[PDB]
Symmetry: C2
Subunit: 164 residues, 2 copies
């Protein structure tokens, strides 16, 4: 795990996807016109159910997926018809944000994407500076980072689909 | 900023972010395109050429500024509506944060901008940008970080 005292209990509920880095591729992021993404993390007994929303162009897609633990505290695996994605929590304060490392094996590719999730839409200054230092350390350039626009069209469909 | 000398700020600057209400838305529308500035001294006034994307195209503006009481405050008098630009913070080497209040015929606009000497490694200047725009009353929702589309930048690099 890269955080070693991780408990998913401290991470359930709603998150906004504030930024991502991709290369490379374209545009992626987303486409146109960018729309913010978000995630609902759900504990469904030995499975993590994640529901994400992003703009796949003419629509807000809601994508629900299951993750299992992947051998290390904060290491999870998600298998999709493409291939495996391996997601790692890289840093968190356990209270406002979580920085995630994603290796994803689609059609014979291996790209890594990193993402900054936050509990809130304001006062992410400290989280984003952290995320710019860690993406850097992982080989990403300032051109690789995409800070999402505060257009919440998809977000609100995810909040609402989760409320009732 | 207190002791300011414009010889330090001559030249090409890239606009990394701006703040406005604001627107419508922003910037841008888508795709945004980056903005840029060229600062020249032309017969005792400040000659400023800026470019940015305004719905569908790169705009090239060319303005002239006068010093406006105290070291880092400049006034742009356009057809009697003003722009007041202040340098809020700078490290005198890689970035300058500018506060701009414009009266564009009736309307008041308060924009703040982050200009950089470089396109890379602006992490610290952006975090300072976030702290200085929240202090000035802007939300995180009000900050726009420019996409690295360099079409308007290259336009201004050529000539103007």
């Amino acid at each position: 795990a890269v955080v070693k005292d991780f408990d998913i209990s401290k991470f359930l509920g709603f998150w906004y996807e504030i930024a991502f880095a991709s290369k490379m591729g374209t545009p992626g992021l987303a486409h146109k016109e960018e729309k913010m993404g978000a995630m609902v993390v759900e504990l469904k007994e030995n499975l993590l159910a994640l529901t994400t929303t992003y703009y796949s162009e003419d629509h807000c897609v809601l994508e629900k997926v299951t993750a299992t633990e992947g051998d290390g505290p904060a290491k999870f695996q998600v298998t999709r018809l493409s291939g495996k994605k391996e997601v790692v929590v890289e840093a968190t304060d356990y209270l406002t944000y979580a920085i995630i490392d994603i290796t994803s094996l689609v059609a014979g590719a291996v790209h890594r994407t990193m993402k900054l999730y936050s509990r809130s839409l304001d006062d992410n200054g400290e989280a984003l500076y952290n995320f710019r230092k860690i993406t850097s350390d992982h080989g990403f350039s300032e051109t690789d980072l995409y800070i999402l626009k505060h257009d919440l069209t998809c977000v609100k469909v995810l909040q609402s689909a989760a409320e009732s």
